[PDB]
C-alpha cells in the first residue's frame, strides 16, 4: 500500500490472525497493514539494516520470512526443516547480519520416525537473503542446547543467548563465553535466571535482557539488567531492585539511561544508580513488552491483547491506546525504526 516516508519514525508489531502492522509514531495511528503468509507464531520481527525489510519468525517457529514494508511483498523465506526426516524449530533464535546479507537461526531439530522421535543436536543455519523464497542453508555449524535470542554486533560477530551468552564467529562457527550466566560462579549469589523472548531493537543499540538472582528461604530476590553493546561488544550487568513483583521486559530510557522501565502487571520506573523504585503505574491489563521511541518521549506497551498503550515516561501515565486491527499480539515484539 502506501510506502513508508523517509525521516519518519515507525513501529512494527505483529497481530494474531497473521498481520504485520506499521504504526506511524508521530500520530500514533496505524499507517498500513500487511497480511503475512502461512500461519502466525510467534510473529517475532526485527528490521533489516535497510529500514525497509522486516524479518519474521513465523509459521509455528519453523520458518523465517522477509517482508518489504513499502509494498507488503514477501521477499524472502527460509524453511528451518531442510534436513531430510527432521522438523526444525527456532526458540526465538534468529538474527540479521550488519549488512543485511545473511540471516542466522539456531534450529533445534527432531527426527520424526514412524513409531518414535529422536531429538537431535541443535545447529546454526545461515541463509543468504539474496536467495529469495526458496532459501536453503549456505552454511551450518553445531550449537549448544537451550539457545534462544541472538543479535549480530556491528563487527559481524553474533552474540548468542544460551546457558551463557556466547560470542560467535559466523564464518568459522567457533564461539567463546562472552558473559557467563549459568557458569557465573559469583560468590554470595545463586546462578541467574533468564526468561527473555523479546529481541529489542532499542535506540541504545544494545542486546539487553532482565534476569533475577538470589543473594544469600533466606535468599534475597533481586532484579538485574544485562547488556551487550552492539557497537563495542562491551558487556554489563547490575541488580537494580529487590524483587517485589515480576516484569517480563525492561528497557533503559534513551533519554535518561539511569532509568529502567519494567512491565507485566504494573509499569515500574526504576533508578539504576539508587537501585530504587521511583514510580509505578497500574495497567488496564497485563502487558508483556515495552518499546521506546527514538527520543524516549513515549513508551509503548505491547504484547497480550490487540492494543498498544502509549505512556508518557516522565509522568508515567497512559496518554492513549492504539487499537490494532485483528486479535492478540501475544509474544510479539514492538520494533521502532526511522525509515
Amino acid at each position: 500500500g502506501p510506502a513508508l516516508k523517509a525521516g519518519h519514525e515507525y513501529m512494527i508489531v505483529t497481530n494474531y490472525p497473521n498481520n504485520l502492522h506499521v504504526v506511524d509514531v508521530a500520530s500514533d495511528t496505524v499507517y498500513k497493514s500487511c497480511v503475512m503468509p502461512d500461519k502466525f507464531g510467534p510473529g517475532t520481527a526485527m528490521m533489516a539494516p535497510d529500514n525497509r525489510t522486516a524479518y519474521v519468525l513465523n509459521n509455528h517457529y519453523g520458518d523465517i520470512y522477509g517482508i518489504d514494508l513499502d509494498t507488503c511483498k514477501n521477499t524472502f523465506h527460509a524453511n528451518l526443516s531442510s534436513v531430510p526426516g527432521e522438523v526444525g524449530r527456532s526458540m526465538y533464535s534468529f538474527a540479521i547480519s550488519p549488512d543485511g546479507k545473511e540471516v542466522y537461526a539456531t534450529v533445534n531439530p527432531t527426527q520424526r520416525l514412524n513409531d518414535h522421535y529422536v531429538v537431535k543436536p541443535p545447529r546454526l543455519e545461515v541463509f543468504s537473503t539474496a536467495d529469495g523464497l526458496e532459501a536453503k542453508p549456505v552454511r551450518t555449524f553445531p550449537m549448544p542446547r537451550q539457545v534462544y535470542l541472538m543479535r549480530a554486533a556491528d563487527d559481524g560477530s553474533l552474540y548468542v543467548a544460551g546457558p551463557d551468552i556466547y560470542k560467535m564467529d559466523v564464518k568459522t562457527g567457533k564461539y567463546t563465553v562472552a558473559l557467563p550466566l549459568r557458569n557465573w560462579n559469583r560468590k554470595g549469589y545463586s546462578a541467574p535466571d533468564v526468561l527473555y523472548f523479546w529481541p529489542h531493537q532499542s535506540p541504545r543499540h544494545e542486546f539487553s535482557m532482565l534476569y533475577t538472582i538470589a543473594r544469600f528461604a533466606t535468599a534475597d530476590l533481586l532484579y538485574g539488567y544485562l547488556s551487550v553493546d552492539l557497537k563495542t561488544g562491551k558487556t554489563h550487568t547490575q541488580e537494580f531492585a529487590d524483587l517485589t513483583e515480576l516484569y517480563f521486559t525492561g528497557l533503559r530510557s534513551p533519554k535518561d539511561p539511569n532509568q529502567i522501565y519494567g512491565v507485566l502487571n504494573r509499569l515500574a520506573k526504576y533508578d539504576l544508580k539508587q537501585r530504587k523504585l521511583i514510580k509505578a503505574a497500574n495497567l488496564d491489563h497485563t502487558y508483556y513488552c515495552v518499546a521506546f521511541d527514538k527520543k524516549g518521549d513515549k513508551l509503548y506497551l505491547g504484547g497480550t491483547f490487540n492494543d498498544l498503550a502509549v505512556f508518557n515516561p516522565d509522568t508515567l501515565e497512559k496518554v492513549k491506546n492504539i487499537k490494532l486491527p485483528g486479535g492478540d499480539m501475544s509474544t510479539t515484539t514492538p520494533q521502532v525504526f526511522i525509515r
Binding site: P17, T304, T331
Partner: protein, 77 residues
C-alpha cells in the same frame, strides 16, 4: 501444588511462584496465547506450536472471543 495444577511458574498457570494468583495474567486471557503459542503449559493449556495449531481459530481476540476456545481431549461421542 495440587495433582491437577502446573508447577512451572513462569509466572505459572493455576498458581504463581509466590503461591497466589496475583503474579498471573490479569486477566488470564492476556497471557493465554503467550502460554499457548510456545506450549508453556501443555498439560493444561493446549499447544499451538505443535499439537493443536488451530486452537484459537475462532478466537483470535481472546479478550472478546474466549468463549470459542474448546476443550481438546477426544472424549467418547
Amino acid at each position: 501444588a495440587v495433582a491437577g495444577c502446573t508447577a512451572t511458574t513462569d509466572p505459572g498457570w493455576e498458581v504463581d511462584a509466590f503461591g497466589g494468583v496475583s503474579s498471573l495474567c490479569q486477566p488470564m486471557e492476556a497471557d493465554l496465547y503467550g502460554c499457548s503459542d510456545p506450549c508453556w503449559w501443555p498439560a493444561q493449556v493446549p499447544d499451538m506450536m505443535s499439537t493443536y495449531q488451530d486452537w484459537n481459530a475462532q478466537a483470535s481476540n481472546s479478550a472478546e472471543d474466549w468463549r470459542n476456545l474448546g476443550t481438546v481431549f477426544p472424549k467418547d461421542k
